[PDB]
Scaffold this active site. Structure first.
Site, PDB file in Angstrom:
ATOM      1  N   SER A  45       2.180  -8.067   1.867  1.00  0.00           N
ATOM      2  CA  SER A  45       2.892  -9.109   1.135  1.00  0.00           C
ATOM      3  C   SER A  45       4.160  -8.629   0.459  1.00  0.00           C
ATOM      4  CB  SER A  45       2.003  -9.791   0.109  1.00  0.00           C
ATOM      5  OG  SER A  45       1.018 -10.604   0.742  1.00  0.00           O
ATOM      6  N   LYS A  48       7.197 -10.566   1.462  1.00  0.00           N
ATOM      7  CA  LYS A  48       7.542 -11.872   0.897  1.00  0.00           C
ATOM      8  C   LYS A  48       8.891 -11.838   0.180  1.00  0.00           C
ATOM      9  CE  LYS A  48       2.766 -13.531   0.770  1.00  0.00           C
ATOM     10  NZ  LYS A  48       1.422 -13.179   0.248  1.00  0.00           N
ATOM     11  N   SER A 105       1.681 -14.714  -4.724  1.00  0.00           N
ATOM     12  CA  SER A 105       1.390 -14.152  -3.398  1.00  0.00           C
ATOM     13  C   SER A 105       0.700 -15.168  -2.453  1.00  0.00           C
ATOM     14  CB  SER A 105       0.588 -12.851  -3.514  1.00  0.00           C
ATOM     15  OG  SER A 105       0.985 -11.950  -2.493  1.00  0.00           O
ATOM     16  N   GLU A 141       1.599 -15.128   8.317  1.00  0.00           N
ATOM     17  CA  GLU A 141       0.367 -14.925   7.579  1.00  0.00           C
ATOM     18  C   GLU A 141      -0.781 -15.659   8.248  1.00  0.00           C
ATOM     19  OE1 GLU A 141       2.073 -12.900   4.185  1.00  0.00           O
ATOM     20  OE2 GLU A 141       0.122 -13.039   5.178  1.00  0.00           O
ATOM     21  N   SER A 212      -1.395  -6.131  -0.026  1.00  0.00           N
ATOM     22  CA  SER A 212      -2.631  -5.468   0.364  1.00  0.00           C
ATOM     23  C   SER A 212      -3.070  -5.989   1.715  1.00  0.00           C
ATOM     24  CB  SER A 212      -3.702  -5.561  -0.718  1.00  0.00           C
ATOM     25  OG  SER A 212      -4.185  -6.906  -0.827  1.00  0.00           O
TER      26      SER A 212
HETATM   27  O1  R6Z Z   1      -6.691 -12.465  -1.784  1.00  0.00           O
HETATM   28  C1  R6Z Z   1      -6.444 -11.303  -1.586  1.00  0.00           C
HETATM   29  N1  R6Z Z   1      -6.837 -10.691  -0.409  1.00  0.00           N
HETATM   30  C2  R6Z Z   1      -7.532 -11.347   0.654  1.00  0.00           C
HETATM   31  C3  R6Z Z   1      -7.301 -12.655   1.021  1.00  0.00           C
HETATM   32  C4  R6Z Z   1      -8.046 -13.165   2.084  1.00  0.00           C
HETATM   33  C5  R6Z Z   1      -8.972 -12.374   2.741  1.00  0.00           C
HETATM   34  C6  R6Z Z   1      -9.181 -11.059   2.380  1.00  0.00           C
HETATM   35  C7  R6Z Z   1     -10.210 -10.120   3.044  1.00  0.00           C
HETATM   36  N2  R6Z Z   1     -10.584 -10.060   4.349  1.00  0.00           N
HETATM   37  N3  R6Z Z   1     -11.522  -9.073   4.455  1.00  0.00           N
HETATM   38  N4  R6Z Z   1     -11.723  -8.545   3.244  1.00  0.00           N
HETATM   39  N5  R6Z Z   1     -10.918  -9.189   2.376  1.00  0.00           N
HETATM   40  C8  R6Z Z   1      -8.452 -10.550   1.318  1.00  0.00           C
HETATM   41  C9  R6Z Z   1      -5.750 -10.436  -2.583  1.00  0.00           C
HETATM   42  C10 R6Z Z   1      -6.056  -9.094  -2.693  1.00  0.00           C
HETATM   43  C11 R6Z Z   1      -5.423  -8.367  -3.650  1.00  0.00           C
HETATM   44  C12 R6Z Z   1      -5.717  -6.914  -3.819  1.00  0.00           C
HETATM   45  N6  R6Z Z   1      -6.895  -6.377  -3.494  1.00  0.00           N
HETATM   46  N7  R6Z Z   1      -6.785  -5.068  -3.833  1.00  0.00           N
HETATM   47  N8  R6Z Z   1      -5.575  -4.811  -4.372  1.00  0.00           N
HETATM   48  N9  R6Z Z   1      -4.905  -5.988  -4.355  1.00  0.00           N
HETATM   49  C13 R6Z Z   1      -4.514  -8.953  -4.491  1.00  0.00           C
HETATM   50  C14 R6Z Z   1      -4.219 -10.283  -4.375  1.00  0.00           C
HETATM   51  C15 R6Z Z   1      -3.200 -10.898  -5.303  1.00  0.00           C
HETATM   52  F1  R6Z Z   1      -2.644 -11.979  -4.725  1.00  0.00           F
HETATM   53  F2  R6Z Z   1      -3.757 -11.324  -6.450  1.00  0.00           F
HETATM   54  F3  R6Z Z   1      -2.178 -10.112  -5.613  1.00  0.00           F
HETATM   55  C16 R6Z Z   1      -4.844 -11.048  -3.425  1.00  0.00           C
HETATM   56  O1  R6Z Z   2      -4.180 -11.941   3.797  1.00  0.00           O
HETATM   57  C1  R6Z Z   2      -4.710 -10.943   3.473  1.00  0.00           C
HETATM   58  N1  R6Z Z   2      -4.554 -10.381   2.209  1.00  0.00           N
HETATM   59  C2  R6Z Z   2      -3.750 -10.973   1.177  1.00  0.00           C
HETATM   60  C3  R6Z Z   2      -3.543 -12.345   1.023  1.00  0.00           C
HETATM   61  C4  R6Z Z   2      -2.716 -12.787  -0.020  1.00  0.00           C
HETATM   62  C5  R6Z Z   2      -2.166 -11.915  -0.943  1.00  0.00           C
HETATM   63  C6  R6Z Z   2      -2.413 -10.582  -0.753  1.00  0.00           C
HETATM   64  C7  R6Z Z   2      -1.825  -9.651  -1.735  1.00  0.00           C
HETATM   65  N2  R6Z Z   2      -0.770  -9.897  -2.508  1.00  0.00           N
HETATM   66  N3  R6Z Z   2      -0.569  -8.839  -3.291  1.00  0.00           N
HETATM   67  N4  R6Z Z   2      -1.506  -7.935  -2.973  1.00  0.00           N
HETATM   68  N5  R6Z Z   2      -2.296  -8.458  -2.024  1.00  0.00           N
HETATM   69  C8  R6Z Z   2      -3.205 -10.111   0.267  1.00  0.00           C
HETATM   70  C9  R6Z Z   2      -5.583 -10.171   4.428  1.00  0.00           C
HETATM   71  C10 R6Z Z   2      -6.451  -9.189   4.007  1.00  0.00           C
HETATM   72  C11 R6Z Z   2      -7.205  -8.495   4.945  1.00  0.00           C
HETATM   73  C12 R6Z Z   2      -8.186  -7.445   4.531  1.00  0.00           C
HETATM   74  N6  R6Z Z   2      -8.309  -6.912   3.311  1.00  0.00           N
HETATM   75  N7  R6Z Z   2      -9.333  -6.010   3.404  1.00  0.00           N
HETATM   76  N8  R6Z Z   2      -9.799  -6.031   4.652  1.00  0.00           N
HETATM   77  N9  R6Z Z   2      -9.086  -6.912   5.369  1.00  0.00           N
HETATM   78  C13 R6Z Z   2      -7.088  -8.770   6.299  1.00  0.00           C
HETATM   79  C14 R6Z Z   2      -6.205  -9.767   6.724  1.00  0.00           C
HETATM   80  C15 R6Z Z   2      -6.021 -10.056   8.213  1.00  0.00           C
HETATM   81  F1  R6Z Z   2      -5.893 -11.368   8.437  1.00  0.00           F
HETATM   82  F2  R6Z Z   2      -4.876  -9.493   8.637  1.00  0.00           F
HETATM   83  F3  R6Z Z   2      -7.033  -9.539   8.948  1.00  0.00           F
HETATM   84  C16 R6Z Z   2      -5.439 -10.459   5.779  1.00  0.00           C
END
Ligand code: R6Z
Ligand code: R6Z
Length: 263
Positions: A45, A48, A105, A141, A212
């Protein structure tokens, strides 16, 4: 040469078990500190910022563009839509989408920015127009966060991203009002307190964008106004070989702390 800061970053990296990428630009002297600065990392992200900046650039020749409505349909919602889901079957303006993408995000908001630019290659084309030959956005995304080791898609290097962030936020890649708007958005981020910010003295002011993804990928890019010093730009990218690793925002904080102490 390997500097004392680089040795400390190497020790941090070794203890973390992952791969860390750091680039600092100090505008006090334009000097740079780099760690794996020319290696590619998945942006997640943090990309973005480039999309929102590209839309700001379009707005320089269309005074009403940021008020342009965009339909949010139920099928547009992806996997993280805290703002866009409130607008399903309605609309959001490009300013609202940019704010949601940068400060919350929101992944649906990001996809609307990408679409306003003609797809991922429209974001890459803007990067090239502002001098970034390294950045590439290939997917929308959420798949741009797959973060597969060795995959070139949706990557950049720390050095290139720090240079571009400098040009966007402190330089003249954008017009003055657009640059001010980007800085306002970044300073209002809600997601950043455990990342670069957590490694810096509390008196400094930070605007940042996190990211992430899979492979325990944990990223942050920041513009920093220290106490008593000209601004800095700092990029911290981290990714892990264990696919299901948990993210490590604390590693980013530790890297920022090492950078701050070595100034
Ligand atoms: O929503 C998040 N992630 C997400 C979304 C959808 C699916 C999966 C997933 N798929 N499989 N496992 N998780 C993970 C996410 C994670 C982090 C993060 N995590 N650690 N450090 N930062 C931070 C944010 C944010 F926006 F608040 F900044 C959002
Ligand atoms: O969309 C995701 N994440 C997300 C969404 C929105 C905000 C942030 C964020 N913003 N700031 N920090 N994080 C992060 C995401 C996470 C995982 C994941 N996480 N762990 N294992 N798989 C895998 C995928 C996919 F689709 F590619 F397979 C997408």
């Amino acid at each position: 040469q390997t500097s004392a800061v680089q040795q400390k970053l190497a020790a941090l990296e070794k203890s973390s078990g992952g791969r860390l990428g750091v680039a600092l630009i100090d505008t006090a002297d334009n000097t740079q500190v780099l760690y794996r600065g020319d290696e590619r990392f998945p942006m997640c992200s943090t990309s973005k910022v480039m999309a929102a900046a590209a839309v700001l650039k379009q707005s320089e020749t269309q005074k009403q563009l940021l008020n342009q409505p965009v339909e949010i349909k139920p099928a547009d919602l992806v996997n993280y839509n805290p703002i866009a889901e409130k607008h399903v079957n309605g609309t959001m303006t490009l300013a609202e989408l940019s704010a949601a993408a940068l400060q919350y995000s929101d992944n649906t908001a990001m996809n609307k920015l990408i679409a306003q630019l003609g797809g991922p290659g429209g974001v890459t084309a803007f990067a090239r127009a502002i001098g970034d030959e390294t950045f590439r956005l290939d997917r929308t995304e959420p798949t741009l966060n797959t973060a597969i080791p060795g995959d070139p898609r949706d990557t950049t290097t720390p050095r290139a991203m720090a240079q571009t962030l400098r040009q966007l936020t402190l330089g003249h890649a954008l017009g003055e009002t657009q640059r001010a708007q980007l800085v306002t958005w970044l300073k209002g981020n809600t997601t950043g307190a455990a990342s670069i910010r957590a490694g810096l003295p509390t008196s400094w002011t930070v605007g940042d964008k996190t990211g992430s993804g899979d492979y325990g990928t944990t990223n942050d890019i920041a513009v920093i106004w220290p106490q008593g010093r000209a601004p800095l730009v700092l990029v911290t990218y981290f990714t892990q070989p264990q696919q299901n690793a948990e993210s490590r925002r604390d590693v980013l904080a530790s890297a920022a702390r090492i950078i701050a102490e070595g100034l």
